Amino acid sequence: FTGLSKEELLKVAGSPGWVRTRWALLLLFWLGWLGMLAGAVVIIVRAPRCRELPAQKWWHTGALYRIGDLQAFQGHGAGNLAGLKGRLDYLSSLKVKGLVLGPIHKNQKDDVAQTDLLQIDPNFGSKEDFDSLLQSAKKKSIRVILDLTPNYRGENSWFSTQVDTVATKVKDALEFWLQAGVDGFQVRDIENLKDASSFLAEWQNITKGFSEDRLLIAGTNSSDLQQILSLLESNKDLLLTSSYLSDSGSTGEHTKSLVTQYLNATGNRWCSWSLSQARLLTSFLPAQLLRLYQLMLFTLPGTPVFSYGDEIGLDAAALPGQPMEAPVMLWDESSFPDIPGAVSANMTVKGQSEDPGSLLSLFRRLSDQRSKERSLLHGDFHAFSAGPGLFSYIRHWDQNERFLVVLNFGDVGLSAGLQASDLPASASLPAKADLLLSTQPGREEGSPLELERLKLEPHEGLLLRFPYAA
Amino acid sequence: VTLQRNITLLNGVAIIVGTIIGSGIFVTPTGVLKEAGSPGLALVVWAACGVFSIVGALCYAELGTTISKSGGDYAYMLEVYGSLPAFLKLWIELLIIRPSSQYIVALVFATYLLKPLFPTCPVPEEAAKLVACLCVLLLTAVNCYSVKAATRVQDAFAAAKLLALALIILLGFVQIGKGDVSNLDPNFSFEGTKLDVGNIVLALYSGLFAYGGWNYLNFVTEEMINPYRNLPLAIIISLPIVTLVYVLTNLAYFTTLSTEQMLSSEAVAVDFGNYHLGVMSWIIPVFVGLSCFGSVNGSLFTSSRLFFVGSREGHLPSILSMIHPQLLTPVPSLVFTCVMTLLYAFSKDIFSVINFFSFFNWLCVALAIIGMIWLRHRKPELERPIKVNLALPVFFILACLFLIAVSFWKTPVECGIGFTIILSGLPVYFFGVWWKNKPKWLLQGIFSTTVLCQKLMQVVPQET
Numbered sequence A: 001f002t003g004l005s006k007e008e009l010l011k012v013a014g015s016p017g018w019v020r021t022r023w024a025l026l027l028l029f030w031l032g033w034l035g036m037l038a039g040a041v042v043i044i045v046r047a048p049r050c051r052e053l054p055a056q057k058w059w060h061t062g063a064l065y066r067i068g069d070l071q072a073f074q075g076h077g078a079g080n081l082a083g084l085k086g087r088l089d090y091l092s093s094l095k096v097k098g099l100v101l102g103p104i105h106k107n108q109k110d111d112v113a114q115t116d117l118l119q120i121d122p123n124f125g126s127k128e129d130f131d132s133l134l135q136s137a138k139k140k141s142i143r144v145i146l147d148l149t150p151n152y153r154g155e156n157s158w159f160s161t162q163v164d165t166v167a168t169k170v171k172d173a174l175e176f177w178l179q180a181g182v183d184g185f186q187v188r189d190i191e192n193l194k195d196a197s198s199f200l201a202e203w204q205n206i207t208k209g210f211s212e213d214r215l216l217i218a219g220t221n222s223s224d225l226q227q228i229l230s231l232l233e234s235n236k237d238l239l240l241t242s243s244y245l246s247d248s249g250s251t252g253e254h255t256k257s258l259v260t261q262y263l264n265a266t267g268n269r270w271c272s273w274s275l276s277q278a279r280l281l282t283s284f285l286p287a288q289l290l291r292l293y294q295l296m297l298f299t300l301p302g303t304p305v306f307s308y309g310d311e312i313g314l315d316a317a318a319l320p321g322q323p324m325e326a327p328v329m330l331w332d333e334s335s336f337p338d339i340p341g342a343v344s345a346n347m348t349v350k351g352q353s354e355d356p357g358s359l360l361s362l363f364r365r366l367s368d369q370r371s372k373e374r375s376l377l378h379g380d381f382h383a384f385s386a387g388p389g390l391f392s393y394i395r396h397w398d399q400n401e402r403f404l405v406v407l408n409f410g411d412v413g414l415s416a417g418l419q420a421s422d423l424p425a426s427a428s429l430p431a432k433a434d435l436l437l438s439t440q441p442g443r444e445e446g447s448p449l450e451l452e453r454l455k456l457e458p459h460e461g462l463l464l465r466f467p468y469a470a
Numbered sequence B: 001v002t003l004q005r006n007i008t009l010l011n012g013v014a015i016i017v018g019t020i021i022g023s024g025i026f027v028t029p030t031g032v033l034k035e036a037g038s039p040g041l042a043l044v045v046w047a048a049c050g051v052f053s054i055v056g057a058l059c060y061a062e063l064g065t066t067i068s069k070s071g072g073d074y075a076y077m078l079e080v081y082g083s084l085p086a087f088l089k090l091w092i093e094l095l096i097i098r099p100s101s102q103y104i105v106a107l108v109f110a111t112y113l114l115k116p117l118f119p120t121c122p123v124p125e126e127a128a129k130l131v132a133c134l135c136v137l138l139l140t141a142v143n144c145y146s147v148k149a150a151t152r153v154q155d156a157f158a159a160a161k162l163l164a165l166a167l168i169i170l171l172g173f174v175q176i177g178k179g180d181v182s183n184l185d186p187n188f189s190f191e192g193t194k195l196d197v198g199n200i201v202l203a204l205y206s207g208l209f210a211y212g213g214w215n216y217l218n219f220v221t222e223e224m225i226n227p228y229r230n231l232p233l234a235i236i237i238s239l240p241i242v243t244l245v246y247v248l249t250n251l252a253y254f255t256t257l258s259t260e261q262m263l264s265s266e267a268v269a270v271d272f273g274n275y276h277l278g279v280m281s282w283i284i285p286v287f288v289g290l291s292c293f294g295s296v297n298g299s300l301f302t303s304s305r306l307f308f309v310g311s312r313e314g315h316l317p318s319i320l321s322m323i324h325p326q327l328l329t330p331v332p333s334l335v336f337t338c339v340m341t342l343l344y345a346f347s348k349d350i351f352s353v354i355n356f357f358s359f360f361n362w363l364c365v366a367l368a369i370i371g372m373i374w375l376r377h378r379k380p381e382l383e384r385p386i387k388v389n390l391a392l393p394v395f396f397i398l399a400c401l402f403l404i405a406v407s408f409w410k411t412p413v414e415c416g417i418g419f420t421i422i423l424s425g426l427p428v429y430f431f432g433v434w435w436k437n438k439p440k441w442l443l444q445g446i447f448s449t450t451v452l453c454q455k456l457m458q459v460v461p462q463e464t
């Protein structure tokens, strides 16, 4: 009811000069469409490409959990092999991708003739129970690594006898246990095994001969870099857990030098980060540094290996009358029958599980972040200089959220002075960054924080993040 | 000169199927499993959502057969509640809802089409925007050219998306029939009744996004051949097929990927294709993009018709609802819809207006069904070839009221902002529609603009 009708429009809209404009506008529209398509094509072509994935294995994704003494993990009571089915749920909580069970084979004494790595010791259980445990763990997406150290009851890892017999016996054991369905092996105290390099290479070859998702782990006690490197001269894909890192490197500069030297010497290859082969973190660190080292080990380029109870900080100096190698796990206040009441409420797993400022919550957050972020999964690592006593580095893979870790190992407060001036332009740190967490409560989370006036409290760590910006 | 009746039963079925099956089935299952925990709970949520959608579709089928005029869900309110609520709904529909939805679907199409080129690094936005704009322009040009071509395109793309879903079903069946699964008989493991209903309803909420669009056929009524018989038959054919296909697709998803893999995924279909194909795994994302393409068409068409009706009642300028004498298509309405859709390419927070308006659909549906019941009570003289038994609409109304209460519960602040935006539509109504005795210097300007647009587009007013 507003405008011309059919007849008037026919009269006034058919003249030349009004039909030319319609065709002209149609051609302009089609030319604009073609130009937009050409622009989109040239933008797509002139763009950086993605970077191919490095084909991560199952043990490249998260941390490893070690259960040295199986009897003491379930507290006072039966140490039957099936009891782990009640605790396995917890492993998933911690989001650990592995589980190194202790030696469960027959072992009388240093007599090699009566010790066989084929039969499970009757105290722990039976073969059917082990198969049930393996199947349940596989259904839970948690892998199992079996320790095959012959003489674990004795002081010496081996029987001090002639090597070849023990080597043949263990190499026979690997085949049977692989047919059983285990996902990896571990051998400890190889410094007591003469010519261990050839045996380790042959065992790695026979383990890889079954599948490419089979792991072999070796353990030493030597902190010498050259001795560690000599073991890996003939082996490229062997995880060697050693006490190299834990050599009283409390100060930040020494720790940074150790990490950088090891990474440079190994050729930036995949490694395992731990403080020892069978010892807890507290055996080498004071109680004031446990959070710092847990923040460190969950961000370094490798597989972090933690012993059982390291998520809540067990120690053998708080409960007397205990072995130095097999502390009892503190599940509840009834964990320790002796001295009935010495166990407090903050030293137990259930007490820390509800406290948002305990070691357990920090461990859970770090394990969740490590096994989910691609930069922490397989990102490049670059450490840069800072103040006198600070360890500062950055993780960046291709284009994902870059991570920046700053640790203050000094006993007094100090600034940052984050003067890099040498990092590649692909990962240059910006003026502002977020804050995932801090070791010491008192800092708001998520809020962007300027990295120019960074003040660090004594023994504090920061896990800032920032996006990729070319 | 009118709009010809050239939509058959197959075309209506294709429209409904293409609109419902978009990108929800490839993304939502992650959220459903996140808020449900156990696979069996997710399956029962999807089944319940399907039943709820079937109920609503039957109600709307009866309502649209009772009132056989286009611009559904808006013409019903115009006839029952009057002119002011109808304009209040139409203003919001043409201002925020439709352009944002179309642009979001176009962006999803653009991003998923280019995914094989950049499998890991994110697709650049400066090319996704251009691809989305090209798709919108091409589809609006196709719609402007003819109506039969649009129906053919919709049929082809509905067939394509059905074929993709069938491929997923066959892959899942091949996986499950070759041996162990260990993901179906312990289905109630980790059966999370977290906060009891306090979370369960939220799970249902997520499923609803996958079951949206069953009411878009009512937008294009009085353009179908024999609507009285075809309108309910198309819905009856479409809805159970969609429900069964969705359930089977979820089962196939669960037969391959673990729970932790699913909650850590951003696109379940992409991971499914990567696992089951390895090589030629780009097939799964490409089809997804194609699906979105069809959805865009299924939107634009309907949207145009809505605005067409919006101009016949005087709520919109008379330039709309004008037909090309030869092509017999509403060119100005389609042009306006395309311009409004493209105008949202400059918004950097497009994914927020959906959160702003999440209660608006349920409120409109509840109001329409309440008007259905009131019209049945007060005017028992109309022709009702289909008559759903009572106590069904009242339960659907109760469900819609609970749904809008949940929507307010989830996020109150932008719900209030949406209330304010809706209330902002009163001055425009009182200036444009209510004010008749306009100053003489405005009527001449509007007339000149309309005449210029007519001469540019060669469109004549509709005559009956």
Ligand SMILES: *[C@@H]1O[C@H](CO)[C@@H](O[C@@H]2O[C@H](CO)[C@@H](O)[C@H](O)[C@H]2NC(C)=O)[C@H](O)[C@H]1NC(C)=O
Binding pocket: A201, A202, A204, A205, A234
């Ligand atoms: C281990 O398997 C490889 C491949 O068949 C062979 O030796 C490898 O390659 C060279 C040549 O002998 C050796 O120096 C490496 O130590 C072997 N790499 C491995 C462990 O795969 C040989 O058949 C097997 N035995 C040896 C020598 O390790």
Ligand SMILES: *[C@@H]1O[C@H](CO)[C@@H](O[C@@H]2O[C@H](CO)[C@@H](O)[C@H](O)[C@H]2NC(C)=O)[C@H](O)[C@H]1NC(C)=O
Binding pocket: A191, A221, A222
């Ligand atoms: C590993 O630690 C043990 C002590 O736990 C030490 O082993 C000594 O090795 C030297 C020869 O290398 C010998 O004196 C004995 O074999 C060990 N001495 C002892 C235990 O009295 C040593 O600390 C480490 N082994 C090394 C690298 O020598």
Ligand SMILES: *[C@@H]1O[C@H](CO)[C@@H](O[C@@H]2O[C@H](CO)[C@@H](O)[C@H](O)[C@H]2NC(C)=O)[C@H](O)[C@H]1NC(C)=O
Binding pocket: A264, A265
């Ligand atoms: C140790 O790693 C460095 C890393 O490049 C290798 O080259 C050194 O690079 C640093 C930093 O630019 C400079 O001091 C010299 O260019 C090199 N000095 C060193 C540390 O040697 C180096 O070749 C690697 N191995 C050695 C020989 O230490």
Ligand SMILES: *[C@@H]1O[C@H](CO)[C@@H](O[C@@H]2O[C@H](CO)[C@@H](O)[C@H](O)[C@H]2NC(C)=O)[C@H](O)[C@H]1NC(C)=O
Binding pocket: A344, A346
């Ligand atoms: C467990 O937490 C309590 C609560 O703060 C703390 O108890 C302290 O014990 C230490 C000795 O290690 C002493 O400083 C005081 O007896 C307590 N100080 C307080 C009340 O903070 C301590 O953090 C933990 N208890 C221990 C380790 O004994």
Ligand SMILES: N[C@@H](Cc1ccc(O)cc1)C(=O)O
Binding pocket: B019, B020, B021, B022, B023, B024, B025, B209, B210, B211, B212, B213
């Ligand atoms: N069904 C659409 C989602 C949708 C939601 C609301 C609609 O109005 C239309 C569609 C999809 O699965 O992608």
